[model samples]
Target chain A: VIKSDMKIKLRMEGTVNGHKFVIEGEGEGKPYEGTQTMNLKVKEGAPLPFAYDILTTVFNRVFAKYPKHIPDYFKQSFPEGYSWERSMTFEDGGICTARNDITLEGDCFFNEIRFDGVNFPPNGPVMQKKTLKWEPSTEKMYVRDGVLTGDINMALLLEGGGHYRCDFKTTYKAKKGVQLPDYHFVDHCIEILSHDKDYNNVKLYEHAVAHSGL
Target chain B: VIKSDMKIKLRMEGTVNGHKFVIEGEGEGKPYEGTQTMNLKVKEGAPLPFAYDILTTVFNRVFAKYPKHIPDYFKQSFPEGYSWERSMTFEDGGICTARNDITLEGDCFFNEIRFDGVNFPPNGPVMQKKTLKWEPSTEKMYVRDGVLTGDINMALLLEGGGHYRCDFKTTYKAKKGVQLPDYHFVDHCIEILSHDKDYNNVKLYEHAVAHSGL
Candidate 1:
């Protein structure tokens, strides 16, 4: 006897080429509404390595959450891949994260992300990336809240020379008479980056905090 | 691509004996809502033959227009006893009138007339009646709207000095992306009854109407 009045919301934030940006949005629906939003920032003269790392990490995170459910023919004809990951918490809430990673080899690229917060059980291993693109700048991203929030576009690249930018699309679930809204997955990523904001100051590739003398 | 805010309204009305009662309501949904207001003039004596006729007519109309895609259990319970007549313009837009006649026998003595405007369709026919126990000094009736508007219950009499009544129930299609608010249905029914006030004047039997409808 679920009447009406249920909804869900999600938020995301990350950095590209030493510049930070945030994405926020909500959804309203029954069962689920897959809407999302995304934002990006790029610093002047930032090396391509920084942009590629940020794009790959964001793309990976998106895929780790939302997965494509429709058949191949129903899938977008453009060069792209969809994948998702789901988990549950002891506090009675559930998590679902997914991403659509796409690449046109030497031509174009794109990525989309989807996250759901509901009442799912804690079991199964985390979902992995389904596809990875080679060429970077050609990549574009889009986000939706599942139902009516519309789509948000994002791009990330180094100043001067164009670099590969992972387009990160996201979807949110909003419905009445259901569970609370969630964006913890993206929040976790933001928290991790905030703690290690100074890439040059902090030790690179090492679990240790301090940088070693060269 | 169907965004929110799209809505549809439904209405209905009928007569019992020589007096008429009308119900109204609306909803933002497909097909229509089930609940409606139950407005009837309080009159002493047995339930009007015309009342029963109106109920049966509306019931048949809904079925013909929106045939239920349910299991066999329903078909067996509510078999299509008569052929569909032509579609006629009623207060509630167009209604598929029936060619068959439904009759209730046993002269137990008329007590009270009960009218149910609930939207329980397919499962059970629209209107119902029951035998009364003791006659009241004054005429009395009940009314309601919204999600619980369609269920009707009234008392009558039986030939064996026993009192009884018929319980009427209805079902509706509230699928995702196709559900309407319960209140909308109730309002629509009221409007229909108000529009086609003549529907309340239809006769149950030719001889009865000719002789003041006893």
Candidate 2:
């Protein structure tokens, strides 16, 4: 893992349905600064699995409207935080901070799909009402030793006004090595466009309840 | 279980990141037409479970982009088509045909999440590339006599110019009844978004990869 220095500078902006979201930020103090650095000696590298609470947080809490709109429903897609797990935790050769500024525009509607309640629709869109915007940015998105620890601030404003802010902090320590992709708790979506000194680009665009945003 | 008759009429228009999709159509000559009505003879009423292939379809095929950009992935999420089955089936008591003439405006990218996959970006927006429009419509999307059948045609062009066309025809017979939500094989998405006698509305929206010409 740390045979070489790897850095990820990503700027993800896409629409889930009606909601337009952007995760524009990077780990460490700079973009592609190579988060893992200044390593210390250890017989076996500490295990730092991939962070899901952060991703799921951005998806459910930050980029979502479940449990609130369809409590019974969202309670399934994103069951009260620590509910679902990706298990893609790999052994860490080194570690660093992974932070981002995630936001969704005011007018949103993400009712993308709803089978027997399978079609995902949280970071989904919510159409037809006087809706405002939401910002769920992470304050502490760093991976310490072998765990991912962070504090995200959740804020909102109705189509009119109301800045209700709350905090969602988390500390996730993966079981061990990079957990392979599985079906249930997410055979999640991860694209690593890294070759030599390059990585994946945010050339991703998604449909929305209302376009022109993001 | 033919307690009564019901029909559906829907106008679904939304974007999934890169693709601007719109499923505007009518059913049973229209909704509330009771596709599940006028039941015949059966003990305790046999179960005519709601079909999910069409939905699992939208998520895996049309809305899929995992394995491609993520070779290690595209495989897992879209896991050989039918690997998951949540057995969310309950009990229907009867059966009928479920059909829809769903359409999209060409430039397509629908990466709606599934256990196998969850990143909706291929149908996602790479936006700027002169993305042509798409028109992947499902004409006759319904289940009949325990056998689900339908036809879909896909066609689109890229900004750089690459037109692709394909077809997906299906005829599936479930084990029976109220389908429970499952993974892999898709316990997919289905919705009944209506107000009065017109019981349901297939107002489903998903993200796609191709765009423009919307």
Candidate 3:
């Protein structure tokens, strides 16, 4: 029998070039195929007691010093070819949702960067529709509309070479009779970063909580 | 005290495509300076049962059928480099012998070969001096000036390939107090044929009698 109601959670941990990061999230999907939904909560963040950006910054600095140990093929640009579309019911029966199409590119040295993301939300009056573009030239990602548009100053130590980190929160609403998705989400994340040996150090911390069936 | 008069003997077997050809020969040598001098010896005969040429011919024929199992390599010539050389003292005197170099090169489809040897005793008077060459295109090997100097046919079958059998008598002369070389002679020979995975089947036979006091 095929169960589409599976809930999956993934937690991964490791260090890459001495920088430590973590990712904790959940998703819904089958073992191999189909339109799986994932929440990129804390995609790349420092473990507790360490600031997220600081760890990523330190990892980049250390990796640059030992390029031999760091693989040359890893891509430093924001992930490309990623898209998301999903709808969810909030804990209180309220609905919150978003669909996103994002594209990212950067220079070979990774000193310059550019990114664009479009978001669409349904039944949300406060949700603003917009396209976001960030170019890190003058030390600030620029913003035009509802999108976060501005260059966050990249530390000089990691200007030429470093890793990237992003964090988020998520929830899942699976279809009826579907088995809880096996939380192999970490496998997919690692697959994306497989080329970067340093990224292997990134960790994932899973926090358990109590929830009764509504 | 480091003994300057110690001698060692090494015995080697030859094989092609996992089929045991015969015990090729035995070499004797004494350590001097940083290197060792070794002499290789085989029985006298028309077929030259234990000559490097014969062993290589059989090996190549069998190897062509299953090239993946043979250890032919670039910068190395097969069979020609198959001869053994070691230097050890006779009861009456010491012999200083040089090392032999062999190389092979070719594409995934086939290969070219060349061999150079110096200071080697002329293939025992009756055995004509010969220049050996293999042309995979014609599936034959050329022997320039030996009684067996002619094109030999090769069997190219994926199933059982071909079989080779040869026998030789070998004797060693060594002076007292000389240390034997380590067991690297077999390892070197095997490595030279690394392209073939089945050279380990080469059978080896050896007999040695050492003497003291000239």
Candidate 4:
């Protein structure tokens, strides 16, 4: 025998971005009425050229190293979203060439992600790790006229403590029958900043995420 | 052999929130000047009463169950932030009483968190899981006048798919030597929404987190 307590009726009404919404779930019934809204946690600031600067270096290198197999890789591995962990070495740059371990995760569809890395320099044992986090918002990701548009908050965290960040936006045109979209404007961008006991060091360059390299 | 290539000089300049900042890393030098910026991913909309309503139910029940042990627990387990996983059953409410598994995590100092749960109703196997995520922003967490102030974007994702979300702010007064501050105005608030195969269900009420019972 079923008791009246088992049937819990639910209703919710709220406004987001000046739009009113109502959601209801009838006890023992499926959710029929719901609202579509994203968490609006975007901060106010000047847009940066890239949200994931150092992380972009990693992406550029990855895209450079594996240009031909990227699309199918995403189609099969990260159709929705997933996490990634690996290590890399940048040897082209004479001064800043070093190896580091990286851990990254994000939802390409939602355009939200966070990642971190620990640098292992050949010089000293004074290693440091940094992280960058990008949160999602309704205003951040969307599809318009077959073009996918989105933005990410490139807030970087220093192991020593503090934030070096910016906002970046990108647009990708839809490809016919392509399961995942590849890099376009953000192709090839690469940059990194490394600090030591006495001096600051920065390296910036590009290696295409689509085409092999320049 | 100390090579010139090992010393990479780095410099960066950017404007955030109308302020210009510069960051430089002299090769082999420590970071001296870094900008303090946050991922401004906050959305534009009306603030909700709570960011983690359903999750707050979980928090409420947790606080309710361990009224006396909470402060000390956070002091030991989550001084900065941590993750939690467990199961619970709210039997006080007749209609919405049900057992469920919950996984939660967040940074109390940074004021960011995300959590999810799968509900196991007494009836059938038609189960559903929901998640709420709050991202960190520069404008979200801070301390002033000895009180901790912060905000969270309460974005809920339905098992079937879609977001039912809002934003909420909170403040906590310092408690002398206490490591973690307990709830205040948001105390005791309890709410739940459950859907079945036929009708809508929602339950809202209060049960204090500071006190042992109502």
Better of 1 and 2 by TM-score: 2
Write the residue-wise lDDT of candidate 4 on A97-196 in tens digits: 1122211233112222323323324332122224332211111232333344433323333333333333333433332334443321122222332322
Better of 3 and 4 by TM-score: 4
Candidate 3 global lDDT: 0.22
List, residue by residue over A1-214, the lDDT tens digit for candidate 1. Answer: 1112222233333332233433332322221122222232323223222312332233222211222332111123223323333221212232323333332232222334332333323231111111112211111111223221111111122232222112232433222222221111111111112113322211111010111000
RMSD to the true structure for each prediction, in A, is 25.6, 23.4, 28.5, 25.8
What digit string (tens of lDDT, one per residue) describes model 1 on residues B1-214? Answer: 1112222222334333234454332223211222222232313322343324334223221211112331211112222211222222222221322222221122111112223332323222223322112111010011122111122221223333332223222322211122122111111111223322324322111000000000
Residue B38 shift from truth in candidate 4, angstroms: 34
lDDT of 3 at A66: 11
Model 4 residue runs over 4 Å out of place are A1-174, A180-214, B1-174, B178-214
lDDT (tens digit, per residue) of candidate 4 on B1-214? 2111122222222222122323222212111111011111112111211122333332211222223433432223322323322222222111111122212233112222322323324232112224332221111232334444433322333333333333333433332334543321112223333322221112222232222111
Cα lDDT of model 2 by residue, A43-160, tens digit: 1211212111222223222222112222211112221212111111111101011222222222221212111111111222222222234442323344333333334444434445
TM-scores for chain B, listed for all candidates: 0.20, 0.24, 0.20, 0.25
Q: Taking the candidates in order, what DockQ does each have?
A: 0.01, 0.03, 0.00, 0.01
Best candidate according to lDDT: 4
Task: Give the CA lDDT, 0 to 100, for residue A173 in model 4.
Answer: 36
Q: Which of candidates 1 and 3 is the stronger one according to lDDT?
A: 1
Regions more than 4 Å wrong, model 2 = A1-6, A11-13, A16-153, A156-162, A165-214, B1-30, B36-214
TM-score of each: 0.18, 0.21, 0.17, 0.26
